[PDB]
Amino acid sequence: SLPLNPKPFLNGLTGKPVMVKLKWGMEYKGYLVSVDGYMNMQLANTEEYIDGALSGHLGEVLIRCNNVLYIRGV
Amino acid sequence: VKLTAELIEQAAQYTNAVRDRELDLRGYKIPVIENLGATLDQFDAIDFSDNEIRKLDGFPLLRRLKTLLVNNNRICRIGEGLDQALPCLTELILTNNSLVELGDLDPLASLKSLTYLSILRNPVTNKKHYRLYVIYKVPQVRVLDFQKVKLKERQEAEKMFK
Amino acid sequence: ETILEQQRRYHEEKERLMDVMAKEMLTKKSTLRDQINSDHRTRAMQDRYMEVSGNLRDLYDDKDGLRAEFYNRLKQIKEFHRKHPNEICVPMSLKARENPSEEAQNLVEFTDEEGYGRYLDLHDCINLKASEKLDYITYLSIFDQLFDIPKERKNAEYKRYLEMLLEYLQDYTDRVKPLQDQNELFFEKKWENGTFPGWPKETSSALTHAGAHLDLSAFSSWEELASLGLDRLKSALLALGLGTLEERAQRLFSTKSLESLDTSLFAKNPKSKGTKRDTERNKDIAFLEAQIYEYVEILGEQRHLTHENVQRKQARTGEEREEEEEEQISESESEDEENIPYWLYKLHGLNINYNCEICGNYTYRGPKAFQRHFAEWR
Amino acid sequence: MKLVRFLMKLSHETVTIELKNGTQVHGTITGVDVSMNTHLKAVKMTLKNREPVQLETLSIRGNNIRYFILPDSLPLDTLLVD
Amino acid sequence: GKSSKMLQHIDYRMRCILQDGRIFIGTFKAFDKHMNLILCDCDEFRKIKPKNSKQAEREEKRVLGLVLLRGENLVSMTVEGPPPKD
Amino acid sequence: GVPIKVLHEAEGHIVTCETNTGEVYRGKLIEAEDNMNCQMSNITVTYRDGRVAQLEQVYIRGSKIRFLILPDMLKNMLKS
Amino acid sequence: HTIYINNMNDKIKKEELKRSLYALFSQFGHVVDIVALKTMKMRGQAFVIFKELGSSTNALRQLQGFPFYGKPMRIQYAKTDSDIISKMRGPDYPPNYILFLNNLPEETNEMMLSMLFNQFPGFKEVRLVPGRHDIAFVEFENDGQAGAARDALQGFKAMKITYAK
Amino acid sequence: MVQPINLIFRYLQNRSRIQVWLYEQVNMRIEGCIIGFDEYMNLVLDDAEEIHSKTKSRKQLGRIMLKGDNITLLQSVSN
Amino acid sequence: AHPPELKKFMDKKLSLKLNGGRHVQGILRGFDPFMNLVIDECVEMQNNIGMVVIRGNSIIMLEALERV
Amino acid sequence: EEEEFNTGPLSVLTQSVKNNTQVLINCRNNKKLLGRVKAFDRHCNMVLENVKEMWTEPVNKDRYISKMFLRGDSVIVVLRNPLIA
RNA sequence: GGAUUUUUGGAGCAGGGAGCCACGCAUCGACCUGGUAUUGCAGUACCUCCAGGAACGGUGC
C-alpha cells in the first residue's frame, strides 16, 4: 500500500481480533480494545497460547509496551 | 648506558606488525638486563636486538611478555629462574649470540609455554647432535630455528639420550 | 666464565653498597640512631649509643646538622640492603682466555665505567645538586607510601577508621576522641573490656582492617628494621605464650573467651570439640587482634603524638586550622632536599590588541612596538 | 499521580524491599529521591542464597527495586493526598 | 530537599555492588545524575566481602586504582570505612 | 556531569575499558564523547577466556561500557 | 625498503608465517610490517617492510636461499614502494639500472665487484679494473637487481655509485 | 553519505523483502515487506515469517507490526 | 542530540561486534545521532549479505580494518 | 492525560482503582501478584492491598502481603476479570 | 522528564550421572597426519585438493 505506518495500522486493527507475541515467547489472542502512545495494549476475551497451544482463557488484559515483540491481526 | 626506567620511559612504544604491544630497546649498548619493573608488565614482547647483554637474566615478574627478540647481543648464558619471572614466554629469538655448550641451553627446559625458539648463528649450533639435544631437553618447542620439530626427530632424540 | 671474576665483582659491589649506606649514616647519624632506638624496644638486647651522641647528632667528635629526608634515605638504604642481600645470596650459591682477549684489537674507546658507574650508581645526589636520591633509586617517592595526614610517620590517620567505626556501632554517640579512647584498650583490656562483643561480625571485620593498617604503617615508618625478624618474633610469641593471660582468681583465660580453674582443665580443654571449633574458625581474627596489640604497643609514641594532634586541631579556630593544614600540605609536597595618557596611546597607536604568531603566539599592544619586534633577540 | 512522591514521604518507616536481582532488604528509610534512589539505616540485607548481613547504612539505585513491602499500619489514604 | 544523601558519603571509603555481583571498594570522590561514580584507590573483590572469615578474608582481590564506574551497572553502596586523610 | 569532565581529561592517556560483555581493552584514549563513546588506539584486548589480541584502532559505544580505569595522574576536581 | 619473498612453503598458517618472518628478519633492522596472503595468486609469497633501507639490502644478501620451513627462500627488491612507506615519507628514469661512480678502491677488483655484482642475476656490465680499481660501472639487467646490489653495499665505508640518471 | 533511516525509506519504496535480526535471540529472525515505519523504527511488515535458523522451519504471520526494540539488524533478501 | 564522532571512519572497512556474540564486517556508509549505521558489502561471520542497517542500540564495539 | 488514563489501555488500572476490584499481575520475577489497586501511575508503579503473591518453585507457593509498592518496570501483564466477584 | 548512551528492565530459566577420573544435541572455527596442486610483486572476513584424525576451542538449549 501507499505508505502504511505503524500507528494507523494498529488503529485500523482496534476493534479486531489480534495476537501479540511477547519477547518472552508467550502469546495472547483477543480483541484489541485500544492502544496508547507508548504502545501499551488492551485486549478483551484474551486467550493465552504458550508453545502455540491454548493454555488459559483470561478475559480483559493490559500488556505493558516494553514486553511486546510484535502484533499480528488474526 | 645502563638499562633504566628513564631509558625505558622515552623508548619507542608501538603495536607491531604481528599485532602485539612491543617496546623498542634496540641499539642502546645495554650490557645488563635490569629495571624492567618500569615497563609495568604492559608489553607482549621486548626488542633487545643489537645490544651487549651477556646473560638472559634479571627479569621481574612479567606476565604479559610473550616475545623476546634478542638478536645480535653477546648472550653466553641463560638464567635459571626464567619461568618464575616469565611464565608465558612463547617465542625466544637468540640469533647471532655466544651460546657455546649444549648444557648452557638447559635452562630453557623450564619455560613451559616456549614454542618458538631460534638459536642460529651461535657456536653451539655446530655441536654434534645440537638439534636432537634441543628437541629432547626442550620438548615444548614446536618450531626450532624456523624448521618444524617433526615426530621422527622426537623419536630419534628419544633413542639417543633415553 | 671464570667464577673468580664473578665472585670478585660481587664482593666488590657489596663493599660499594656498605660504603654508600655508611656514607649516609655518616652525613646524618639520625638515620641510624632513629632506627636503632625503635629496634631497642623490639629486640631488648640491642645495644644503643650514648644519649649525648643521639642528641647532639654526632657519631664521634663532629655534631652534624639536623635534617621527610630521613625517611627517604631510610627507604633508599632499604632497597640498598635488598640488593646486598640478593648479591650475598647468589654469591653463596688462563692462556686460553687471554688469547681470546686479543679479539677486536682496533677499538678507539676509553673505558672508565666499571667502578665509577657503580660508585656513582649508589652515591648521594640531578646535574649537580638537586636531588639527594641516588641513580639506583631515582624513581623512589615517599608520597606513594605515606598519605599527607601521616606526615611521613609523624601521625597515623585514624579518622577513616572512626568513620568505619561509626558504621560498625550503628550510631553516632562516638567521637573521634572517644574512638581513640577505645583504641587505647589495645595486655588484657582489649580482651576483657572489649568495645563490642568479640564474636560480632562487623567488629571482627573492622578489627582486621585496622590491624592490617597499623602493621603496614609500622613497617612503613621504620624501613631500616628487618621486617621478617619482627614478624617471626611476634608469631612465636603468639604460639608459645599467647595461657599467657593468668588471673589469681579466675585462672587462665582463652582468646573461647572463657576462664579456667587450673592449668589442668585448661589443657584438657584445648583438645575439646569446642576449642577445636573456635580455634579453627576464629584463628585469623585472634592473630590479627594480637598483632594490632603488639604493633600498637611498638607505636605508643606515634599514637600519643596523633591523639595530641587531634586535640590541638580540635581546639583551633577557622583561620588556625586552615594555616595548620597549609603547613601539613607544604611539608607533604616539598623537595626532600632544598637548594593615564588615554588619547595619547590611541594617537601613538599603542594599547591596541595585536599578535605575532612566530613568537609564542605572543601579544603586542602597539604597532610601533611590533614593528620593533622585527629586530629583537627572541 | 507521581507515586515516587508517595515513597518520598516514607522517611523513618521500616520496610522490606525486594530487588530485581532477588536480594531482600529490610531497613529504615532515611530518604527516597525523584529517581526512586532509596537510602536506609539499620539495614539487614539478604542477598539471594546468603545469610543476612547488617549494615548501618545502604543506598539503592532506584531502578534496581522490584517492590516495597510497607508497614501494615501504614495509613495509605492519608499519604495519597497531595 | 537536601540532595546530601550522596554528598555526605563523599570522600569516604565505600563498598559498591555491581549488577553482575562484583564488589568495588574505593574512595568515593564524585558522582552525577546517572550515578556514574569516581572511585580512588579502588580494588575489586569477587568471592566475599569479609566479616572476618577465619580461613581468609580475601580471595580474588584485584588492584584497579582510579576507577570511573557507569551508573547503569551500579546496584548499591554502603560505607566501608572513613576517609583516608591524605 | 563531574565524572564526564574527568574522563575528557584522560584523553591522550593510556586507559583500560571493560565492556558489558567483559572484554578488556587497554590503550590510548583518543576521543571520549559526552555519552561515554570511546575512540582508542594501539589496543591490547583480553577476552573472557584469558587470550589476548592486538588492535590498531577501536571505537566502543558508551552504553555498552561497564567501566573505565584512568591514570592516577588525574587524582590530584577536589572542590566538589 | 620492502623485499619480496617467494618460494615459501604455503602449508604454514598465515599468522605463524608472518610471526616467523618477523622473527627471522628482525636481526637486520626494525620490520615495520609484513604483507602476506594465502589467495591462489599470492600464496607462497610475502612482502617484508623495513624502516631502514640498509636493513633491507643486508637482509636480501644474507638470507638469499635460506631454508625456511623446508624450502630455500628467494628474495628480491619489490617492484613498487609499499603503501606504508609512502605514507611515512609524505625525475622519470629512477629507479635506474646502471650505477657508475667511484670511491671503492683498496685492492678492490673486477672479479671482486664481478662476484658481488654476480650475486645478482642482473649481472650485466662490470667495469672495475684499471690502475684505478676505484671506478665502478655496473649495468644490472634490471633496477630491482641493480637496486638489490646497490642496497646490499649501499654505504661501502663512503663509496660513490651514481645510477646513470 | 547514506543515512540509516533513508535506507529504510528505500526498502519501503522498493518493496524488497527484508530480513530482521532480533535482539538477544539468534535462533529466530523475522522476514517481511516493509509497508511503513515510524520514528521509533517500529515496522509494519507484510506477508511476514518467523525463521528458525536451528529447525529450518518457517512460521507464517501475515500482517505484522514489529516493535523496533527487537531490531539488531536490517538486511534485504532476493526471495 | 549529539552526533557520534564517526566521520573519520566513513568509507572505511570495519569489524563490528554485536550483541548475541554476533560479528559482521563491512564499509561504513553513514550514521545518525542514535549510532544507527549503514554498512555496505556486509559479511556475516562467512556469507555476503550486501548493504545493511545496524541499529546503534545493538552495537557493542567497532574496530577499523584500515588506518584512519 | 487523564483522558489517556481513562480510555487508553491503562483504563484497566483506572477501572480497578475506582471499583476497588481485584487484578492479577503477571510479573517479571515469574511471580504473580493478586490484589487491589490503591494507586498507579504511567510506569505502572502501584500501591497494592490484600496481595496474594503466587509463584512456583515442581511446587506451588503463595504468601499474603497486606500493603506494598510495585515498581512498574516489573510488569509484564495486568489482568482484570470476574476475579473480585 | 517510560521509545536506541544510564532511572521505569532483554529478562527469565536449565547440570547431575557412572566407576580422583570421564561425560547429551546443534552450529562455526581454526587443527593434527599423510599425500598432492600452484613459482604467482601484494596491503587481506578464510583461502590448493584428496584421505584419515579430533580423550580441540567458543556459543545456545
Radius of gyration of chain F: 13 Å
Order of SSEs of chain I: EEEEE
Distance between the termini of chain F: 11 Å
Question: Do you know the CATH architecture of chain I?
Answer: Roll
In CATH, the topology of chain F is named SH3 type barrels
**Binned strand content of chain F:** over 45%
Oligomer: part of a larger assembly
State the share of residues found in helices of chain I, binned by percent.
under 10%
Query: What gross morphology of chain I would you assign?
Result: globular
Terminal Cα span of chain I:
25 Å
The fold-level CATH name of chain I is: SH3 type barrels
Number of domains of chain F: 1
- Strands of the widest sheet of chain I, in order across it, are 4-3-2-1-5
Order of helices and strands of chain F: HEEEEE
Structural class of chain I: mainly beta
Major beta-sheet overview of chain I: 5 strands, antiparallel
> How many structural domains does the protein architecture of chain I include?
1
Subcellular location (chain E): Cytoplasm, Cytosol; Nucleus
Family (chain E): Belongs to the snRNP SmB/SmN family.
Protein name (chain E): Small nuclear ribonucleoprotein-associated proteins B and B'
Protein name (chain F): Small nuclear ribonucleoprotein Sm D3
How would you characterize the overall build of this protein?
This is part of a larger assembly, with ten protein chains of ten kinds. Chain B has 162 residues and is an alpha/beta fold. Helix content of chain B is 16%, strand content 17%. Chain B has four helices and ten strands, in the order H-E-E-E-E-E-E-H-E-E-H-E-E-H. Chain B has helices spanning 5-9, 82-85, 130-137, 151-159; strands at residues 13-15, 21-24, 45-47, 55-56, 67-69, 77-78, 91-93, 116-118, 143-144, 147-148. Chain B is globular and about 50 Å long. With 82 residues, chain D is mostly beta strands. Helix content of chain D is 12%, strand content 45%. Chain D has a five-stranded antiparallel sheet with strand order 4-3-2-1-5. The radius of gyration of chain D is 13 Å and the shape is globular. Chain H is mainly β and 79 residues long. Chain H has a five-stranded antiparallel sheet. Chain H has one domain: SH3 type barrels (Roll), CATH 2.30.30. Helix content of chain H is 14%, strand content 58%. In chain H, strand 3 and strand 4 (57-66) form a beta hairpin. The chains are: A mainly beta (74), B alpha/beta (162), C mainly alpha (378), D mainly beta (82), E mainly beta (86), F mainly beta (80), G alpha+beta (165), H mainly beta (79), I mainly beta (68), J alpha+beta (85). Chains in contact: A-H, A-J, B-C, B-F, B-G, C-D, C-E, D-E, D-J, E-F, F-I, H-I. Chain G binds one RNA strand of 61 nucleotides through strand 1.
